[PDB]
Design a protein around this motif. Structure first.
Motif, PDB file in Angstrom:
ATOM      1  N   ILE A  42      72.816 -10.324  44.923  1.00 52.48           N
ATOM      2  CA  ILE A  42      74.192  -9.840  44.604  1.00 52.48           C
ATOM      3  C   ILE A  42      74.099  -8.431  44.006  1.00 52.48           C
ATOM      4  CG2 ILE A  42      76.180 -10.204  43.101  1.00 52.48           C
ATOM      5  CD1 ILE A  42      75.847 -12.086  45.642  1.00 52.48           C
ATOM      6  N   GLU A  43      73.144  -8.223  43.098  1.00 54.59           N
ATOM      7  CA  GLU A  43      72.954  -6.899  42.439  1.00 54.59           C
ATOM      8  C   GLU A  43      72.539  -5.850  43.475  1.00 54.59           C
ATOM      9  OE1 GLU A  43      69.835  -5.555  42.490  1.00 54.59           O
ATOM     10  OE2 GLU A  43      70.384  -3.685  41.481  1.00 54.59           O
ATOM     11  N   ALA A  44      71.639  -6.215  44.394  1.00 56.20           N
ATOM     12  CA  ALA A  44      71.142  -5.267  45.415  1.00 56.20           C
ATOM     13  C   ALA A  44      72.282  -4.811  46.331  1.00 56.20           C
ATOM     14  CB  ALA A  44      70.034  -5.917  46.208  1.00 56.20           C
ATOM     15  N   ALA A  45      73.123  -5.749  46.779  1.00 55.42           N
ATOM     16  CA  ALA A  45      74.244  -5.408  47.687  1.00 55.42           C
ATOM     17  C   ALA A  45      75.236  -4.479  46.980  1.00 55.42           C
ATOM     18  CB  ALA A  45      74.913  -6.673  48.156  1.00 55.42           C
ATOM     19  N   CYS A  46      75.563  -4.796  45.724  1.00 57.86           N
ATOM     20  CA  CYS A  46      76.538  -3.989  44.939  1.00 57.86           C
ATOM     21  C   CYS A  46      76.008  -2.573  44.686  1.00 57.86           C
ATOM     22  CB  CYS A  46      76.857  -4.671  43.613  1.00 57.86           C
ATOM     23  SG  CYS A  46      78.272  -5.797  43.721  1.00 57.86           S
ATOM     24  N   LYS A  47      74.719  -2.434  44.366  1.00 56.29           N
ATOM     25  CA  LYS A  47      74.165  -1.086  44.065  1.00 56.29           C
ATOM     26  C   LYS A  47      74.293  -0.186  45.300  1.00 56.29           C
ATOM     27  CE  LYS A  47      70.366  -0.472  41.699  1.00 56.29           C
ATOM     28  NZ  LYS A  47      70.915   0.524  40.750  1.00 56.29           N
ATOM     29  N   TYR A  48      73.947  -0.702  46.482  1.00 53.48           N
ATOM     30  CA  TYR A  48      74.041   0.100  47.730  1.00 53.48           C
ATOM     31  C   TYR A  48      75.503   0.445  48.025  1.00 53.48           C
ATOM     32  CZ  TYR A  48      74.148   1.057  52.770  1.00 53.48           C
ATOM     33  OH  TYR A  48      74.377   1.606  53.999  1.00 53.48           O
ATOM     34  N   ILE A  49      76.391  -0.546  47.887  1.00 50.05           N
ATOM     35  CA  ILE A  49      77.850  -0.354  48.162  1.00 50.05           C
ATOM     36  C   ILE A  49      78.449   0.636  47.161  1.00 50.05           C
ATOM     37  CG2 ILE A  49      80.095  -1.491  48.068  1.00 50.05           C
ATOM     38  CD1 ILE A  49      78.972  -3.875  49.431  1.00 50.05           C
ATOM     39  N   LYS A  50      78.088   0.515  45.884  1.00 50.13           N
ATOM     40  CA  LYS A  50      78.651   1.408  44.834  1.00 50.13           C
ATOM     41  C   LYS A  50      78.251   2.863  45.107  1.00 50.13           C
ATOM     42  CE  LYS A  50      79.854   3.144  40.761  1.00 50.13           C
ATOM     43  NZ  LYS A  50      81.252   3.587  40.547  1.00 50.13           N
ATOM     44  N   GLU A  51      76.980   3.101  45.445  1.00 49.92           N
ATOM     45  CA  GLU A  51      76.497   4.482  45.714  1.00 49.92           C
ATOM     46  C   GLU A  51      77.184   5.057  46.957  1.00 49.92           C
ATOM     47  OE1 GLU A  51      72.240   4.098  45.924  1.00 49.92           O
ATOM     48  OE2 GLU A  51      72.114   3.329  43.867  1.00 49.92           O
ATOM     49  N   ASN A  52      77.283   4.266  48.030  1.00 47.75           N
ATOM     50  CA  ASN A  52      77.899   4.751  49.297  1.00 47.75           C
ATOM     51  C   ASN A  52      79.379   5.078  49.080  1.00 47.75           C
ATOM     52  OD1 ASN A  52      76.216   3.595  52.228  1.00 47.75           O
ATOM     53  ND2 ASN A  52      75.360   3.695  50.166  1.00 47.75           N
ATOM     54  N   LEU A  53      80.107   4.192  48.393  1.00 47.79           N
ATOM     55  CA  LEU A  53      81.564   4.379  48.154  1.00 47.79           C
ATOM     56  C   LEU A  53      81.833   5.613  47.284  1.00 47.79           C
ATOM     57  CD1 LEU A  53      83.997   2.682  49.147  1.00 47.79           C
ATOM     58  CD2 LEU A  53      81.731   1.741  49.590  1.00 47.79           C
ATOM     59  N   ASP A  54      81.016   5.845  46.253  1.00 45.30           N
ATOM     60  CA  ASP A  54      81.267   6.999  45.352  1.00 45.30           C
ATOM     61  C   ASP A  54      81.185   8.309  46.148  1.00 45.30           C
ATOM     62  OD1 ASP A  54      81.629   5.304  43.239  1.00 45.30           O
ATOM     63  OD2 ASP A  54      79.988   6.107  42.009  1.00 45.30           O
ATOM     64  N   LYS A  55      80.150   8.456  46.977  1.00 48.61           N
ATOM     65  CA  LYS A  55      79.989   9.673  47.813  1.00 48.61           C
ATOM     66  C   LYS A  55      81.111   9.744  48.855  1.00 48.61           C
ATOM     67  CE  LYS A  55      76.536  12.052  50.733  1.00 48.61           C
ATOM     68  NZ  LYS A  55      75.173  11.957  51.307  1.00 48.61           N
ATOM     69  N   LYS A  56      81.437   8.596  49.456  1.00 46.57           N
ATOM     70  CA  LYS A  56      82.438   8.494  50.558  1.00 46.57           C
ATOM     71  C   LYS A  56      83.860   8.876  50.124  1.00 46.57           C
ATOM     72  CE  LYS A  56      81.559   6.836  54.874  1.00 46.57           C
ATOM     73  NZ  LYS A  56      80.271   6.987  55.587  1.00 46.57           N
ATOM     74  N   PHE A  57      84.337   8.425  48.956  1.00 49.14           N
ATOM     75  CA  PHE A  57      85.755   8.722  48.620  1.00 49.14           C
ATOM     76  C   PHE A  57      85.949   9.343  47.229  1.00 49.14           C
ATOM     77  CE2 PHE A  57      87.495   6.590  52.359  1.00 49.14           C
ATOM     78  CZ  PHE A  57      86.508   5.687  52.681  1.00 49.14           C
ATOM     79  N   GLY A  58      85.765   8.555  46.162  1.00 48.10           N
ATOM     80  CA  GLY A  58      86.027   9.058  44.798  1.00 48.10           C
ATOM     81  C   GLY A  58      84.901   8.786  43.818  1.00 48.10           C
ATOM     82  N   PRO A  59      84.828   9.522  42.685  1.00 49.13           N
ATOM     83  CA  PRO A  59      83.743   9.359  41.709  1.00 49.13           C
ATOM     84  C   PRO A  59      83.661   7.965  41.068  1.00 49.13           C
ATOM     85  CG  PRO A  59      85.553  10.648  40.780  1.00 49.13           C
ATOM     86  CD  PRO A  59      85.798  10.533  42.269  1.00 49.13           C
ATOM     87  N   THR A  60      84.808   7.359  40.742  1.00 46.00           N
ATOM     88  CA  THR A  60      84.806   6.025  40.079  1.00 46.00           C
ATOM     89  C   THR A  60      85.315   4.930  41.025  1.00 46.00           C
ATOM     90  OG1 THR A  60      85.532   4.746  38.184  1.00 46.00           O
ATOM     91  CG2 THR A  60      87.038   6.455  38.954  1.00 46.00           C
ATOM     92  N   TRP A  61      84.391   4.243  41.706  1.00 41.61           N
ATOM     93  CA  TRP A  61      84.726   3.154  42.661  1.00 41.61           C
ATOM     94  C   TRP A  61      83.998   1.873  42.231  1.00 41.61           C
ATOM     95  CZ3 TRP A  61      87.681   3.952  47.316  1.00 41.61           C
ATOM     96  CH2 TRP A  61      87.785   2.818  48.121  1.00 41.61           C
TER      97      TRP A  61
END
Lengths: 106, 51
Positions: A52-71
């Protein structure tokens, strides 16, 4: 045969690529970009045993670059939560099996 | 002719030319602008294996 032959264990084993969307509050064009990225990222970081932690870390990093700083996105087998988000910044989609994914923009 | 008159007489329209020059200045204006972020709403989602 058909639905009667199918079982909950059988249905999960038969299809692992099925995508189901339960709640939509974000613009459809934005959802298409997010859905492709989350499905690809989870499978890549799934590894021998899903983390669960591994999936969230990858998703959190991709989303921050993709749209906004706090996702913030949280995935769990089962959960109850109250979240305050900006208009058209929250997308809720759960993967086939016991996998619930929540992604929102703050 | 007096010396003072000669000094006045020395100055001539061709001898001394006066031109008035000014620089264009935009009129000062007062404007008020208010910005307020998009409305945010609270969302509660419960996920279960059966659902």
């Amino acid at each position: 045969k058909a639905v009667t032959d199918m079982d909950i264990n059988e249905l999960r084993k038969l299809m692992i690529g099925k995508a189901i969307i339960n709640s939509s509050d974000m613009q459809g064009d934005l959802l298409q970009e997010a859905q492709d990225v989350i499905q690809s990222g989870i499978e890549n970081n799934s590894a021998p045993v899903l983390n669960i932690e591994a999936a969230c870390k990858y998703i959190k990093e991709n989303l921050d670059k993709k749209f906004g700083p706090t996702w913030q996105c949280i995935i769990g087998e089962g959960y109850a939560y109250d979240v305050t988000v900006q208009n058209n910044t929250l997308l809720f989609m759960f993967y086939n099996g016991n996998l619930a994914v929540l992604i929102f923009k703050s | 002719h007096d010396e003072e008159a000669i000094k006045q007489t020395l100055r001539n329209k061709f001898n001394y030319n006066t031109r008035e020059c000014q620089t264009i200045n935009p009129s000062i204006r007062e404007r008020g602008v208010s910005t307020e972020p998009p409305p945010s709403d609270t969302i509660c989602g419960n996920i279960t294996q059966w659902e």
